[PDB]
Design a protein around this ligand. Structure first.
Ligand SMILES: CN1CCCN(C(=O)c2cccc(-c3ccc(/C=C4/C(=O)Nc5ccc(Cl)cc54)o3)c2)CC1
Ligand SMILES: [Cl-]
Length: 272
């Protein structure tokens, strides 16, 4: 039974389900307990055992080594109307959207540290065969003591493949023009677009495009002082033609990305 976790308060709820704070009774491990209604589940999937499960579980197991840039699935249960996942919970922790709301635009140095960590994490998912598809500030947690970001919510994700996707259920205003115009995208180039949006969100304090037409026109106006190198990087990720977008390798070799702080230094200077 799930009588082996003590449940605390609701942390948040939405398209990902309802997520509660918890503590594993076994060892007082802090956890997050996520509930997902079977009626509301997008894709389903295939475990070795043979058992049928939400794609989210498959995706999380494919990725849940101990690399700390992606949230670790500790356990899961099936209930009559629902699945419950036990996830690791850092503490103290704060979600990036909150951090930006409280802080406004982030200094470049801290945006760089954070953006590099997000890139390492997304490369991790891709090497484990998983496409997140909903990269944005709300799906990123900051472990405030260690200065470590973790990607969460794989509920809109998919197995990574090299052919075209024609379905999408993440967030529209993070989605690339080719989704909006043709309902087709490739995994990596769409991911790069959404990383451009994310990076703009960090340095300007808000997303650049509210509407379909703005996404499709792809003109980027900066409302804050942002350095030329960072503007270049963002505009490159936000190229209209997918194949003009940089690879992960070209983004991590970009001049704006050099000399990144280690996560612990980041915590010491900007979060402690
Ligand atoms: C505005 N209000 C006040 C600030 C304090 N505060 C936070 O920033 C805060 C701190 C920790 C978590 C969350 C939060 C909300 C929604 C979720 C969703 C999760 C999910 O889908 N998978 C997960 C795995 C691990 C964890 Cl820890 C959370 C999730 O997580 C939010 C509440 C917001
Ligand atoms: Cl959409």
């Amino acid at each position: 039974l799930e009588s082996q976790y003590q449940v605390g308060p609701l942390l948040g709820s939405g398209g990902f389900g309802s997520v509660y704070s918890g503590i594993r009774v076994s060892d007082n491990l802090p956890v997050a307990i996520k509930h997902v209604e079977k009626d509301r589940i997008s894709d389903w999937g295939e475990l070795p055992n043979g058992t049928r499960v939400p794609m989210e579980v498959v995706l999380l197991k494919k990725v849940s080594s101990g690399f700390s840039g992606v949230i670790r699935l500790l356990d899961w249960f099936e209930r009559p109307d629902s699945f419950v996942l036990i996830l690791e919970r850092p503490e103290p922790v704060q979600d990036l959207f909150d951090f930006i709301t409280e802080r406004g635009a982030l200094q470049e140095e801290l945006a760089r540290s954070f953006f590099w960590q997000v890139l390492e994490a997304v490369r991790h998912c891709h090497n484990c065969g998983v496409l997140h598809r909903d990269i944005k500030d709300e799906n990123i947690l900051i472990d405030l003591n260690r200065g470590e970001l973790k990607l969460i919510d794989f509920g809109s994700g998919a197995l990574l493949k090299d052919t075209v996707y024609t379905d999408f259920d993440g967030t529209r205003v993070y989605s690339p023009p080719e989704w909006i115009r043709y309902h087709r995208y490739h995994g990596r180039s769409a991911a790069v677009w959404s990383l451009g949006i994310l990076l703009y969100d960090m340095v300007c304090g808000d997303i650049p495009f509210e509407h379909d037409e703005e996404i499709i026109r792809g003109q980027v106006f900066f409302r804050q002082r942002v350095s030329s190198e960072c503007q270049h990087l963002i505009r490159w990720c936000l190229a209209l033609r997918p194949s003009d977008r940089p690879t992960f390798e070209e983004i991590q070799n970009h001049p704006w990305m050099q000399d990144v702080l280690l996560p612990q230094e980041t915590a010491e200077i900007h979060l402690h």
